[PDB]
Write a protein that binds this DNA or RNA. Structure first.
Lengths: 66, 66, 65, 66, 66, 73
RNA sequence: UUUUUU
C-alpha cells in the first residue's frame, strides 16, 4: 500500500520532509520510524512523536519514485 | 465504490483537481495514486502525500461521469 | 437505516441541499451519488466529492419523509 | 449503554434539545430519530441531518432520568 | 489495564468535579453522572450535557485521583 | 525455546520509555493549545499527564505532537 | 489513537 511504501522510502533514504498538521503548524525533519498511528520525526537535535490523525499532508524535499 | 471509481477516473485520465483540506488550505494537482488512507497528489514535479482524514472536498477541473 | 434512506430520498426526488462542513464552510447542490465515506454533490456542471468525516449538517430545501 | 438510551428517551418524550457542534455552531430542536452515525433533528418545517462526529454536546430542556 | 474507564469511574463514584475541555476551545464543569464508550453525561445541578468523547480534549479533576 | 514476535509498536515503546524514565514532555493539542508534564499512564485512547498538582486525562485523538525534554532511544 | 460516534 501507498502510505507505508512512501513513508519507508523517506525513512531508508533519509529524505527530509515538511509535515503540515491539521491545526496549521508545520515541522521538518527526517522520518526515523513510524507505525500505524504515529510518525517519529527527528530534526537533528529534537524529536517529535506525531500522530497521523493530526497530520494534514507530508511534503518531501526531493522526488520519491517508488 | 463511488470514492474509488471517482479517484481512479481522475488518475487514469490525469484530470487536474483542487483538494480542499479541513483546515482551510487548498492544493492543485493530479492524483498519481491513492490507498485507504492517503492520496498522492502531484504538481510542478512536486509531490504531496495527503491524508484523507484531512480532506474536506475534491473538485475536479473537468466533469467526471461514471 | 436513517442516513442512507435520508441520503437516497434526496438523490431520487432531486431535492436541493445545503451542506455545512465541520470547518465552517458551506456548499449547496444536489446529491448525485454516495457511498460509505463520500457524497457526490453537483451544482450545474460542478462536482464536489465530499468526505463525510468533513460534513457537519445536511439541510434539504424541502421536507423529507 | 448510555448514548442510545439517552437519545431515544429524548426522541420519544419529545424533549427539546440544544445541539452544540464541533465547529461552534448550535442548533436547537427535536430528535426525530437517529442511527449509528447521524441524528435527524427537527424544529418546525426545518430538518437537519447532523453527523455525530460533528456534535460536541446535547443539552436537554428538561431533566432526563432512569 | 484500562486507564480511561478506571479514571472516569473513580470520578463518577467519589463525585469529583471535573473541568472538561473541548477540542473547539469551549469548557464545561460538572460531575460525571455516567459514561459509555462514546459519550459522557456531565451533570451540574439540574443541568445535563451529553458530551461526545470525540469532542473532549482533556478532563481535569479538581481533586486528586489514585 | 525462543520467545515469539513483535511487531514494532513505536507508540507504546516511546510512551513507556517516557513513563518509566520520568522524562518531562511538551504536548501539543490539535486545537493549538499545549501542556507540560510527566506521562503517568496511558491506554489505547488516553494519556494521563501529571504536572505538579494537576492531573490531565488527555484524549489521544486530541494530541497533535509530543516533544520530550531529552533524547529517547 | 491513520477515509461516516473515544
Amino acid at each position: 500500500n501507498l502510505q507505508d511504501r512512501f513513508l519507508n522510502h523517506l525513512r531508508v533514504n533519509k529524505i527530509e520532509v515538511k509535515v503540515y498538521l491539521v491545526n496549521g503548524f508545520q515541522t521538518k525533519g527526517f522520518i526515523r520510524s513510524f507505525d500505524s498511528y504515529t510518525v517519529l520525526l527527528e530534526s537533528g537535535n529534537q524529536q517529535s512523536l506525531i500522530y497521523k490523525h493530526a497530520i494534514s499532508t507530508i511534503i518531501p524535499s526531493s522526488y520519491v519514485m517508488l
